[PDB]
Amino acid sequence: TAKKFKVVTTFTIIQDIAQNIAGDVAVVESITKPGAEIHDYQPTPRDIVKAQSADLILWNGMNLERWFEKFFESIKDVPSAVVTAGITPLPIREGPYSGIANPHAWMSPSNALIYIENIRKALVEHDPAHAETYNRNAQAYAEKIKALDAPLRERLSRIPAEQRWLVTSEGAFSYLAKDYGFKEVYLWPINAEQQGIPQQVRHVIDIIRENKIPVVFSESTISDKPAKQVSKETGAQYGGVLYVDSLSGEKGPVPTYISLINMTVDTIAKGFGQ
Ligand SMILES: [Zn+2]
Question: Is residue 115 a contact partner of residue 84, using CB atoms and an 8 Å limit?
Fold first, then answer.
């Protein structure tokens, strides 16, 4: 066991999934730090250093990292793999990014199984000496992710179908909303320039009042102020922050992808009174 294979990912969700497949034979690090906004991140010379010292770079694609392709042109002789191949996208519904793929595919546990398979294939391709370890680790982790779906689905099924309205800040939850049958309301369709402008707030306030939606949420990498404004003006409670674009730190309450899905579903369910 000389030097461990080095994997660099664009953001923290992929870091944790890949580290579970890598186990003990590779070290996986994320370019972005926990809590950092990932869509419009501005890479630094230090990020270039980290990616250039890697043996493999993983990214989401599907229009998530607006910075990645320009950044990756600075990197020489390091293979890359997009980890969303074979996932059917949901289009963004409005705004300047309307009609392109919504990038947040990992919020569906069923899609996470495809993430796992793509990361496994990339590790086996570029570090074939450890293929048996990657294959064994991916099979074990896929078992855990597959078993995750049923209790989450049952928990959210307790909310009456007509009341399944998921009101968030970024429209980052479209794939979870599809899996578990939620209608989707948001202050902006994808992180970008305008987040919480008028027009956006007014529309969301209208749907909340018409449908008596009981709760609204923010997310961990963006400002909670628009969501709290919406809850102040309506009958909805502020349900707290959901985790989608980033894990917490390792010593925080959302250290893993499994903990992210669990925490987000639990926070939604609590917002609806379980
Ligand atoms: Zn996002």
Answer: yes
